[model samples]
Target: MKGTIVGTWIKTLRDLYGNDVVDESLKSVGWEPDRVITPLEDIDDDEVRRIFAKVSEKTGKNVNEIWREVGRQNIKTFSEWFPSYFAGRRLVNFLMMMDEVHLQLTKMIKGATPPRLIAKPVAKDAIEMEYVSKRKMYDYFLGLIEGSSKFFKEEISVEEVERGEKDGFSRLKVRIKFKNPVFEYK
Candidate 1:
C-alpha cells in the first residue's frame, strides 16, 4: 500500500473517531503516533491491516465496517487532494475510469498494489463492475461506490453478483443500476 492513502486513512480515522483512538491504534501496531508518510513511500499491507484491526477491537466495530467507513470518508480527502479526477466527471464516468487512474497513480511507486476496477455497461442505466485484487477489500470497494454516487448526487442500486477467490486473486462482481440513464438511446 502507498503511504499516501494509508496516511489519509489515519487522518480520516481520527476525524471519525478521535485523536486518542487513532494514536492508540497506531501504537498497538508499533507505529509512531506522529509519523509522516510521503506519497510514494510503501507501507506493508499487513501493518495497515493490524492497525485497522486494533481500531476495530477498540471501537467494537467489524473490520469490514471500519474499512467501509474509511472508504466513504476517503472520497472527500481524495477529491481535495486530486481534484482532477472528480472535476466534470459523472458517477459512471468516474467509476469506469478508476482502473486507468489506479494504474497511472501507482505506476511510479515501488511495491504499490492498486486494485483493478473493470466496468462494463450492462444496460442504459446500469453497469456491471468487476473488482479484482489480492487485497480482498470488498467492503471498502463498495463504500467507495457509495461515496461516488453521493458525490455525484446520483441514485444507485448496487448488488453483489459474485464473490470468490481464484488463482490467488479475490474477485467481486457487482451490478449497479442507476436511477438516471447514463447513456442516451437514439
Candidate 2:
C-alpha cells in the first residue's frame, strides 16, 4: 500500500469514528501502542484492515458500513489543503478547469513532452489530480485553460503570466477570466 492510500484510510477512520475510537482501535492492533502514526511510515494494509475489523466486532458495526463512512469522510480533507485550487467553483467545474489547465500547459512545453494529467473534483473548492510521465519537469502544469473551456463548455479567457525553472522546480502562473458569470442551484 502506498503511503498516500494508507494516509487516506487513516484519515477516513478518524472521520468515521471519533479520534479516540480510532486511536484505541489502532492500539488494539499493536500500532504505536502509545504514540500516533507519524508521517513517514506506510501502515500495513492487513494491519489497517484488522484494526477496522476489530472496530467492527467491538462496536457491533458492519465492516462495509464502517468503510463507507470512512471513505466519505476522508475526502473532506482536500478542501482544507487545496483551497486555492478548488476555490470559487463547483466540484465538476473545478475538475473540468483543471483538466483544461493541464492540456494547455502541456501545449506550451515546445520540445519536452508533458505528462498526461487527469483531474477529479473532490469538493466544492478542491480537486485531486494525477499525472504519469517519465519527464520530470513537473512544472508548466498551469496550461489547462483551453481544455477547461472544452470540458465545461464555457468561454473563458486565459493568460499565461510567467513560467520557467526556479529552485529545481518548474513554475507557472496563469490568470483566468470568465466571459459571463452565472450562478444557480442544482
Candidate 3:
C-alpha cells in the first residue's frame, strides 16, 4: 500500500470525481474519507480501482483517459516541487543523481512511475530539477537525503519552506546547505 502508485491513483480519483464518490467508496468499506485519509497516505489497489470507476462514471471519461489526464496533471504539479529533492549537491551531480534516484525509486515500488524531469544548473552550486510523480511522498524525501548522504559520503542539511497543498498536490520550497567541497567523486 505504502510507496505504491495505487495510492496516487486514489488521490487522483478524489481530484477528478469529487469527494462524494471518495466518501461513498470509503463508506462502502466502513471508512471515512475526511477523517481517515490524508495526503500522501496509501490505499489498496482494489479500492482505488473502484474509486476510479466511480470517477469515470461521473466525469464521462474512460478510465484509461482519466488515468492519463491524472498523470499529466501530476507531472505539472511535480515540476513545481522538484528542486527541493536535491538539497545542496552541485548542479551536474544533482541532475545525474536525480536520474539515478528516479530509476532506483521506481524499481522499489510497483507502478510508481514519475514523469521525465527537466533539470538545469542554475548556480555554481545549485541546480533546478523538475519532474512529476502521481502522488507526493514527503517521507520519501527524507529517504533521499539518507541515500544521497550515503552515496556521496558527505553530510548535508535540508530546510523546507513555502510548502502548501493546492488541489491535492503539494508545493514545497527548501534551502539546502552543504560544507565546502572536497573533490572526490565525479
Candidate 4:
C-alpha cells in the first residue's frame, strides 16, 4: 500500500485510540513514534497487517472494528490530503465516482490492483453496488460509505445483499437507499 493511504491510518489511529497506544503499536513493528512516511513510499503490506494485528491485541478490539473505524474516520484525513475529490460534490456523486478515482489515482503504478467499486441505479432513490477486491476488507468498504454520508450530511441506508469469494476475489453486493432520489429509474 502507498504511504499516502497507510499514513492516514496511522494518523487516524492516534485520533481514535490516543497517541500512546498508537505509538506503542507502531513500535511493535520497529517504526518510530513520529515516523514520517513520504507520500510515494511503498510500505510492506505484511508489515502493515502486523501493525494492525498488534494494535488489536493491545486494544482488545476486533481487527475489523479497527478497519471499520479507520475507514469511517479516515475521510477527514483524505479530505485534508485530497480536497478536490470532495469539492462541490454530493455523497452520491462521490460514491458514483469512487471506482474511477481509485483506478486513476493508482494508474501510475504498473499492475496496480485497486479495489473495484461498481455502482448502478436500481431504483429511483437507490443504487446496487458491488465491491470486488482481493483484500477482503468489506468492513472498511462499508465504513467508507457510511462515513461519506456522515461527512456530506446526507442520510442513507445500506443493506448487504451478499458476500462471498468468487474466482479468487472477495465480493460484496449492497443496496444503498438514499434519503432523496438520486436516479430516475425508467
Q: Which ten residues in a row have the lowest lDDT in candidate 3?
A: 72-81
Q: Give per-residue CA lDDT, model 4, range 44-152, as digits (tens).
A: 7788899899889988999999999988998887888789999999987899998998998788876788899999888889988899998898889998888888989
lDDT tens digits, residues 86-156, model 3? 45664346544665666765565567555334444434444344433445544344334434544455565
Query: What clash count goes with each model?
Result: 0, 9, 0, 0
lDDT of each residue in 59-161, candidate 1, tens digit only: 9999999989988888877888779989998899999999998998899976667899999898999999999999999999998998888888899999999
For model 2, how does the per-residue alpha-carbon lDDT over 1-186 read when each residue is reduced to its tens digit? 334445656665666666777778878877763444534545555776788788788768887666645544444544453356556764356744644654554453345344445544333433345534443322223323343445346665545555555555455444455555433335
The TM-score of predicted model 4 comes to 0.96
- RMSD list, candidates in order: 1.3, 14.0, 13.0, 1.2
Model 2, runs deviating above 4 Å: 33-39, 81-85, 93-186
TM per prediction: 0.95, 0.44, 0.39, 0.96
User: Candidate 1, overall lDDT?
Assistant: 0.89
Which scores greater on TM-score, model 2 or model 3?
A: 2
Q: Candidate 1's error at 170, in angstroms?
A: 0.2
Measured with C-alpha atoms, the lDDT of residue 37 in candidate 2 is 51
Whole-structure CA lDDT of model 4: 0.89
What's the CA error at residue 145 for candidate 1, in Å?
0.5
Off by over 4 Å in 1: none
